Write a protein that binds this DNA or RNA. Structure first.
Ligand SMILES: [Mg+2]
Ligand SMILES: [Mg+2]
Ligand SMILES: [Mg+2]
Ligand SMILES: [Mg+2]
Ligand SMILES: [Mg+2]
Ligand SMILES: [Mg+2]
Lengths: 770, 770
DNA sequence: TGAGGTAGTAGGTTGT
DNA sequence: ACAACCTACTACCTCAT
DNA sequence: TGAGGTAGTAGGTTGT
DNA sequence: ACAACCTACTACCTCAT
DNA sequence: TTTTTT
DNA sequence: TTTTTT
């Protein structure tokens, strides 16, 4: 099918294209030839109305003649047609500013129809973001409406000038509080310092220090007789009862991490966080930053109407989109009562209703898991523990215990008996069957304070003592609402170290997610999701795709920052076929690295010993590589080297999720724009908000040490959309990313927290990190 | 016993002690109140004849009145007696320079009796290093004679100006070559850039670039008409046939690692490395930097004789040392023919002659291993592989194969049969016994190019295919001389991943270490060492100490850098007793960190689940903690927190191996100086050189959250000396560091290369990283 | 990389 | 010219009867 | 931390 | 005012007959 | 509802 | 000397 939709793009008149472009080459960084801190090769090319076409060799392209006080050589001339499309778009975007078409102007135009509002102590201000895209031979401007939230009160006029209140404020927001200094014209963000173990802030009470810093702020920046008037009006006199906060830089470009700083809690403001604000106010600050497609369309049309210039057009652009058929969603292969491989279509049911029979067994068909792991043939008995945070009230603890026990016995055991016996065990003897989750007897319910080291030590000691001689166990943790991080991660890591798979539920769910009719029971949605997630963590694949993929492997790659270091960690997820029609999932860990660039040589070496069929078994094996972000130049250069030796053919694509392009409709679709493909694979069930598409770009084929660029066809889009529909963490899931990228992200995040179990469950689809 | 020895210390006249010391406090870094190049708080205190007594708060102590162009406050006055001993010593050292007693003067005085020599293209220059120590109430100056090696030829006049020769030089020293720019007055060191995979340098041939850089060097630094004369005399004209080398900073303080640099191979020199120089010249450059104790004594006495000043004395100092008895070395507990526990004393044999019977069995007693791992009760079968680098000649390959097979069968199997049968298997049935190392049949000898990725892949494939269904194997690798790093480590890591323990021998050993009588056999020393190391890697402890230690555990801690990251890795080694008389070794991995400071909270949490007896079983457990280096303030602060909860008592000591203090004698001894203990535990078997002592300092006791400083007694020194004599990597070993620190270093280095086997052999004494 | 020792080259962290 | 210390790498030299 | 979506705050790497 | 993307964290809102 | 089933 | 011993 097809349709016509309106997108937030406006055409650009061709008269803006420059006639003559000069090219210059520098010999040294402008920051060193001269001495002006902050000056870079990009600022020099910006001030001359130009772009940087070679950052390594310092080669820039300019419209005017270069006005530089250093050393350079002119490399000649160039025409607009000899630049690449990206640089053409960047140059056109730069030229749009010289005609008054800038973000500073369009934001002011927008703020005539949407006014900056004030909620509590914060202000929300609309703004726009502008980009340029070359579709075929015409340039289009992309305008995206965003909001910014700022604080109108300093840290002094927030705690009512009581130092103790400042102490509570600093201590209760220890993890994620940052202070921005507004008295400076750089607006640098700092982080407060805290004492180890004992917590508590690090204040210093000394009048001389505060006097020196206040006078330094006056003298260094506002060094005119006039400016001191607004300095005294904005912040007042030199308050002396205010302590000084120990703080460090939030960034690291300056480096030299011995730079102590003293912050006066009178010239700084908190940045923004809804955790430090009342719920009734956070509800209305939100729902103002989210706009329906119609509101965006009317606002953009008004902005275009109130622009007086020939350069840009007066109406938004319309594009032709290709709709996605409904039949594509219903392409999964579940297994029925007997043990067949019936499509889910021929049961008059949808994927969401997959465990409705376990509570009724009279109105909905009985549906059984498609795949069960191999180690469950020998493993038939699994201990289960219930851990409860002592910070909850007794009624909540009893409710959580009862809910966990009922979930295990009433819901899981029915499936465990209908699968193991009714459909399997042909004559008193079968091999693969669902295990048994004990929870039997006392001393398996642990009630310790999970927010302290002593409680965690006691919990670990108890579980380890009970776990002697065993190899796989399950745990249900009922945690409090305010459980700090580095304690959640610690609990999960120390439980994984004993080969115990854990599932955590927080207090707010146990108190506000009660059922519709029976208000003394957990909601059906939550219970079904919990059972599905536990089954997926135990290695059971409840359904598989009915699609037939043309490749032999599908690999997703992602990179995550380290916890306490300056480095990065790579992670990947690999899906095999062995016929095309059925897939498995195995996570692969790539080593540490210095930047966001995966060493493709070490990845394939690690992907050879973890295999049996090799990458060159008998003939050429085709590999599909989806990259979260973009394929860097080093990754592409290192793929030709692998293709030279291993004799494989790689097809690489880039998946992007943060782009300013929007389509003003609510349906699953895709369209081709600027050489890339924008795909909306999901539908929004909430009233307020606009769906964010997925950008597929830069498809290329590498073989025999050669790279050939290609264009994305319809089959690739259909394959990506099909891979989108494979989620093992939620039955009623409508996600955006494809499965390999989605699970590579989670595996990288798990490695960041050093969550490893046995290295042998990973090979058979155990997904503890899901 | 006792003796009197001469140490390189000279007394200092008390008249130098200052009368009045001023104290000042700054408000901001002098690099920011003003704008200089590298001005710091330490340079400011140096130029005012003073020290920095508080770096965090910027509090400095000065002798003169402070002359500063910024903001500061005087904190009052202080007397010399109120400073700590370290700051008193630093102040006295600073005051020694104002009287002409500096390194620049004493080095010039020394260079009258030792002249700077020239070997090949390098120059060796003597110099001195000076320190100050306060022993009881008098200050002593420590003078240490060192040498410096510099290059008198640029990179241009080293390759005879042939660009191809320059390419060969750059490619053959790719790993460890650095270039220092001598045309600059900062003498900054750079590292050349190379192309990935394909290797080869990164040169740029362009006359304009070389002209610009040469003129920039002339203009920026030597900006006087006179200086250009020596610039033209030193380096010559602007040579134009010289390419430009791509290079980056060797350091990282500047950061911003996109700042490429172009180096002219005419203004830079190699720094120094004996790998790039002829062997006959490297032999004579060495043996000139090493001095016997007598030469050092005469040189220092001459230096003191030719000093005209009252400030320092005219003769070296004499100290009273306590000798170490011979009986202490012979305190190991080996096990005899029957299987008893006789001390090695009652056999008329020494530790080195521990396997002389396996070749004679008629002149020396038969000696059996004390301990054998528990996993060998079930394991009775071990595959053995022989891997040979294809870069060796055929005769060397055959010799290596024959030597490995003979080592396994003639030497090991005799022990394996005398232990398993003659002494064990009382009635046809025993449990613990030595396994069998196959090398059975062909297809267990692998000959592939180990310097390339293809050869490593093939080797891994073959070993993994043969290793199917097994759990422990052994490998002997015969590698070439020039085997580059990152290939050795890769081979070891990929072999460990298959649970194969490897031992590597290089080509130079197989060609020059032939036996005395039979020149077609490997030397006895090398063969015995190889067998001992293999046995230790397999978990067999051939001997244990006869000492009785007063503590329950001994823990050694070390920190190592990361390979591709900016971070650090902690490692530790723990020795248990369970009675005080016997010891086991278990390595413990501490997590990643940002600096050289181990998180003591996470270490003890990891040391609880890896235990069974806990740190608080029934009563107080004493822990001894030896730190490689020094205990940082954060580590000490985090130990009181642990002592508060876990109810343990920790005794911490600092072990230092790089200090300028020397004793002019050759015997095992120790003495007390400046509050620290200097211990010489080994004897030098080479003619040239002086033994380097071990500095034990800063003993302290932590319990109930309280820290009490203590003094090192004789029992602590005896314990450290006894722990020194426990090495499992060499039978004829006389090392310096204690065993826990020595093995913590190796475990940290192994973690740096990610060498992990199964996490279950680690807990029971396997030492694959030794 | 037989392993330990004594010699060099370069760089980093801590201090409190 | 900020002291003390760590780390990585390279080279020779000696070991038991 | 039921899991996914849409909204904010801050920071980093790549380009070639 | 260097684009164009990634990461970490926080908050609400909706889900299957 | 602090289990079954064999 | 590209093994035993059971
Ligand atoms: Mg990414
Ligand atoms: Mg990700
Ligand atoms: Mg989860
Ligand atoms: Mg260390
Ligand atoms: Mg070490
Ligand atoms: Mg070794």
């Amino acid at each position: 099918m097809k349709a016509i939709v309106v997108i937030n793009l406006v055409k650009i008149n061709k008269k803006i294209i420059p006639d003559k472009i000069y090219v210059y080459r520098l010999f040294n960084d402008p920051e060193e030839e001269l001495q002006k801190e902050g000056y870079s090769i990009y600022r020099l090319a910006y001030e001359n109305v130009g772009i940087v076409i070679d950052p390594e060799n310092l080669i820039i392209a300019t419209t005017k003649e270069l006005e530089y006080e250093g050393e350079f050589i002119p490399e000649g001339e160039i025409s607009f047609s000899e630049l690449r499309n990206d640089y053409q778009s960047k140059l056109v975007l730069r030229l749009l500013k010289e005609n008054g078409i800038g973000e500073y102007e369009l934001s002011k135009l927008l703020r005539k129809f949407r006014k900056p509002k004030t909620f509590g102590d914060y202000k929300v201000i609309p703004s726009v973001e502008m980009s340029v895209i070359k579709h075929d031979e015409d340039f289009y401007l992309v305008i995206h409406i965003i909001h910014q939230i700022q604080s109108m009160k300093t840290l002094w006029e927030l705690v009512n000038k009581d130092p103790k209140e400042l102490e509570e404020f600093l201590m209760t927001h220890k993890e994620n509080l940052m202070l921005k200094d507004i008295a400076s014209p750089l607006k640098t963000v700092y982080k407060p310092c805290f004492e180890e173990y004992t917590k508590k802030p690090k204040l210093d009470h000394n009048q001389e220090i505060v006097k020196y810093w206040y006078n330094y702020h006056i003298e260094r920046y506002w060094n005119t007789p006039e400016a001191k008037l607004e300095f005294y009006r904005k912040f007042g006199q030199v308050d002396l009862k205010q302590p000084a906060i120990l703080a460090k830089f939030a960034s690291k470009i300056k480096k030299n991490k011995n730079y102590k700083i003293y912050l006066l809690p009178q010239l700084v403001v908190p940045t923004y966080n809804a955790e430090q604000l009342e719920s009734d106010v956070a509800k209305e600050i939100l729902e103002y930053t989210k706009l329906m497609p119609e509101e965006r369309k009317e606002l953009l049309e008004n902005i275009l109407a109130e622009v007086d210039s020939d350069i840009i057009d007066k109406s938004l652009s319309e594009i032709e989109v290709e709709k996605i058929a409904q039949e594509l969603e219903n392409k999964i292969r579940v297994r029925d009562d007997k043990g067949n491989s019936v499509p889910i279509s021929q049961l008059n049911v949808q994927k969401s209703q997959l465990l409705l029979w376990t509570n009724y067994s009279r109105k909905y068909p009985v549906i059984l898991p498609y795949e069960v792991p191999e180690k469950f043939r020998k493993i038939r008995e699994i201990p289960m523990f219930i851990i409860l945070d002592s910070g909850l009230l007794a009624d909540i603890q009893n409710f959580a215990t009862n809910e966990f026990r009922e979930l295990v016995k009433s819901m899981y055991y029915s499936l465990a008996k209908k699968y193991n016996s009714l459909a399997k065990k042909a004559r008193s003897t079968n091999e693969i069957g669902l295990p048994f989750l004990d929870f039997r007897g006392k001393e398996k319910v642990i009630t310790e304070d999970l927010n302290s080291d002593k409680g965690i030590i006691e919990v670990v000691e108890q579980v380890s003592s009970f776990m002697k001689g065993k190899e796989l166990g399950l745990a249900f943790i009922a945690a409090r609402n305010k459980l700090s991080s580095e304690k959640f991660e610690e609990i999960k890591r120390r439980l994984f170290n004993l080969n115990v798979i854990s599932q955590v539920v927080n207090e707010d769910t146990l108190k506000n997610k009660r059922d519709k009719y029976d208000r003394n029971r957990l909601d059906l949605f939550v219970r079904h999701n919990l059972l599905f997630q536990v089954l997926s963590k135990l290695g059971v694949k409840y359904y598989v795709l009915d699609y037939r993929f043309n490749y032999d492997y599908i690999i997703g790659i992602d990179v995550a920052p380290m916890k306490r270091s300056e480095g990065y960690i790579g992670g990947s997820a690999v899906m095999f076929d062995s016929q095309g029609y059925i897939r498995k999932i195995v996570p692969i860990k790539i080593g540490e690295q210095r930047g966001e660039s995966v060493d493709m040589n070490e990845f394939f070496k690690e992907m050879v010993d973890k295999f049996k069929e090799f990458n060159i078994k008998l003939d050429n094996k085709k590999i599909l590589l989806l990259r979260d972000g973009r394929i860097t130049n080093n990754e592409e250069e290192g793929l030709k080297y692998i293709s030279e030796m291993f004799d494989i053919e790689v097809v690489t694509m880039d998946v992007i999720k943060n782009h300013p392009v929007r389509a003003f409709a609510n349906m699953k679709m895709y369209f081709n724009l600027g050489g890339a493909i924008y795909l909306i694979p999901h539908k929004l069930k909430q009233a307020k908000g606009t769906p964010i598409p997925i950008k597929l770009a830069k498809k290329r084929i590498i073989k025999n040490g050669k790279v050939e660029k290609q264009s994305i066809t319809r089959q690739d889009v259909l394959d990506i959309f099909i891979l989108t529909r494979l989620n093992y963490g939620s039955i009623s899931a409508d996600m955006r990313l494809p499965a390999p990228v989605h699970y590579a992200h989670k595996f990288a995040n798990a490695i960041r927290n050093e969550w490893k179990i046995k290295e042998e469950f990973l090979a058979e689809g155990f997904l503890y990190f899901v």
